[PDB]
Amino acid sequence: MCLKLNLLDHVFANPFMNAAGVLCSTEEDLRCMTASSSGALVSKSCTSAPRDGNPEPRYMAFPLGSINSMGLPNLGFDFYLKYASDLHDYSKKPLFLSISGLSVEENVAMVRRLAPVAQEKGVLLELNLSCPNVPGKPQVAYDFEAMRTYLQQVSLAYGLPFGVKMPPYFDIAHFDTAAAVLNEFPLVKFVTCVNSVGNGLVIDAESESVVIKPKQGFGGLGGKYILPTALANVNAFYRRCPDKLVFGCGGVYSGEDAFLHILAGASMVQVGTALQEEGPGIFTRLEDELLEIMARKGYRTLEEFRGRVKTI
Amino acid sequence: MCLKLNLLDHVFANPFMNAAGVLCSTEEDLRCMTASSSGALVSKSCTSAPRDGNPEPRYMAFPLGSINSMGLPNLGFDFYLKYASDLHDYSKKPLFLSISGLSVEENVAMVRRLAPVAQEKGVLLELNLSCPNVPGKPQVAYDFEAMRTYLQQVSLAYGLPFGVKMPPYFDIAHFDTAAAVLNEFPLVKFVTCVNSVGNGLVIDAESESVVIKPKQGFGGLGGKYILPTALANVNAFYRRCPDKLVFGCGGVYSGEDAFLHILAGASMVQVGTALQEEGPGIFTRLEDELLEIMARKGYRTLEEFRGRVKTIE
Ligand SMILES: Cc1cc2nc3c(=O)[nH]c(=O)nc-3n(C[C@H](O)[C@H](O)[C@H](O)COP(=O)(O)O)c2cc1C
C-alpha cells in the first residue's frame, strides 16, 4: 500500500508538504525540502522586493505550539521565480509558489510574471490572503470586499489555475460568506485552511515578558493550540466548496492528526510548526503513521475516507 | 500578601470566579459557587424564557481543553432575577448576572426589569455579546454595527454600570474597532475577554466521528487551546480601554495562568473548562498557587503587577 495521489494535473507520492514559510526561504531550504520524503513543497510567501522582516526574536516554540511574527522575510519574488523556472527538479515532486504582496497591485505584478513559468514548468500558485504579521496590514480575507477585489484582479492578470491560503474563521456567517466569495472564481482550484491563528500573545511567567519582539508580542499561533480550529475550517470549506480542493494546514504532528485532516476533507496536508521543530525527517514518520492507521482500519486509499467524517 | 480587590463599588476576597455557564445554571449550582472559596460568581447566560438548549452530547473535555455547543440552556430570566433579588447571600460574595437575549429587544426587556434589583441589591450585569452556539445567530460582537446598537439600547434602557462578555478577535483592526465602540459607552465599566473560540471541530480518530451533536460537531473551544488568544485579547483591551476594567477568561488551570492574565491586565480572573473538569475545589488551589508566585517575586498586592507585562525593546 502506498499514499500516491493525483491532483491539479500533477502526481504526488503522498499528501504531505511543508506549510508555506517553514523550511522554504533559501535555495538551501528548498533543496532540502526537495530531498525530503514530502509529496510536494511550497516556497516562502514572497514580495516584489526582498524583505528583512520584523525584528528578532520573532519565532518561539513551546510544548503546545508556536508563536511567530516573521513579517514576510524573503529573498524577493525574482529569486523564487528563478527557483521555479531554472532550479527546481520537477521529476522529484511538484512545486507551489506562495505570494503575499502588500497590495493588490503588488500581487498582480507578480502573477503576470509567474504566468509564463506556470505555463512552461507547471509550478502552482498559492495566493496568501492571510498574513497576520505585517504592521498596519490586516489579513486580507477578513475584509470580504478586499478579498473579492484581490481574487478578481489576480484571476484576470494570471488566467491560470491557482489556490488561496485562507485565515481561520470562527463564525458560521463568515464561513458562508468566505466560501461564497471563493465560489465566484473558477480559477481558484484549491483552498488552504488555515494560516496561523492571528495575534495571539505568549507571556513568560518568570521574566514577566512577552516572548517575541514585534508588535508588542502579538503573533500568529500554530501547532497543538490550533488543531480543532484548523479541522473546522477544512471541513467548513470542504462542505461549502464541493467543486474545489481543500488543503489542510494546522496542528499536524502525527499520522493521526493528518488522518483527521483528511477525514475533514483535506487533499494535501501541510506541516508547519511540527516541521520547524522536528526537521524534514518528520515526513517519513508521518507517512509511516498514516499508513499504519489506514491498515488498522482496512482503508486502501485516501479517497475511501476523505471528507467522510461522521456527524451525530 | 493579599488577593483582595475593591472595584465596581464592591469588595472581593480574591480575583477568582466561575466563567459564565459553568456551575451556575440551577439554584444548587449557585449555592455551590457561593459556598466555594471564589471571590465572586456569575449566573448562566439567560434568555427571557427557559431554554432546553441544543441536543446532547453537547460538551466534551480533553487533555487540551473543551468543546461545547450548549445552546443557552437556562432556567429563564425570571429565575435568575429571583435568585439575585431573594436568594443570593451578598454577605458571602458579589454576584454577576449574565444575559444573552437572542435579539436587542430581548436584552432590553430583561435589563428594564433587572435595573431596580441592581439598584437595590448591587447585582452586576454582564451582557453576553459572544455566544457562538445558537444556530442561525452569529456572535453579536463580530458585527460592529450590531454591537453598537445593542450597547446603545441596553445603556438607555438599563442606565446603570454594566460589563460586556466579548468574543476573541484575531486581527489588530478588530481590536481597534471593538475597543473604540466600547469606549463610546461610559456605562460599560468592565470588559470580559474572552468567550469560547467559536466553531472549532473536534474529531475522534477511532470512531471517525465528531464528538458533539449540534451543528455537525462545530462548537466553542475553551481550555489550554485558547490561553495565548485569551491573553492577547485581555491585553489588547487593557491597552485600548484605559478607563475601563478588563476581566480575564480563557485557559486558566493554575495560579501561573492567572498570574499571566493579571500581568496582561486582568482584574477578575474567570475559570471555565478547568472548573467544569476539576470542580469548585479548584479555587483554593488557584489562590494558593497565585500567592506562591507572588511570594517568590516579592509582590504584596495584585496592583503591583496588574498590566505590567514587559515588551521587548
Ligand atoms: C515560522 C513561520 C513562518 C510562516 N510563514 C508563512 C508564510 O510565508 N506564508 C504562509 O502562508 N504561511 C506562513 N506560515 C503559517 C503556516 O504556513 C501555517 O499556516 C501555520 O503555521 C499553521 O500550521 P501549523 O499548526 O502546522 O504550524 C508561517 C508559520 C510559521 C511558524
Ligand SMILES: Cc1cc2nc3c(=O)[nH]c(=O)nc-3n(C[C@H](O)[C@H](O)[C@H](O)COP(=O)(O)O)c2cc1C
Ligand atoms: C459548558 C460551557 C458553557 C458555557 N456557557 C456560557 C454562557 O452561558 N455565557 C458565557 O458568556 N460564556 C459561556 N461559556 C464560555 C465560558 O464562559 C468561557 O468564556 C470559555 O469557556 C473560555 O474559558 P475557559 O478556557 O476557562 O473554558 C461556557 C463555556 C462552557 C465550557
Ligand SMILES: O=C1C[C@@H](C(=O)O)NC(=O)N1
Ligand atoms: O502568512 C504568514 C506570514 C508569516 C510571516 O510573518 O512571514 N507568518 C504567518 O504565520 N503567516
Ligand SMILES: O=C1C[C@@H](C(=O)O)NC(=O)N1
Ligand atoms: O456564550 C456562550 C454560550 C454557551 C452556550 O452554548 O450556552 N457556550 C459558550 O461557549 N458561550
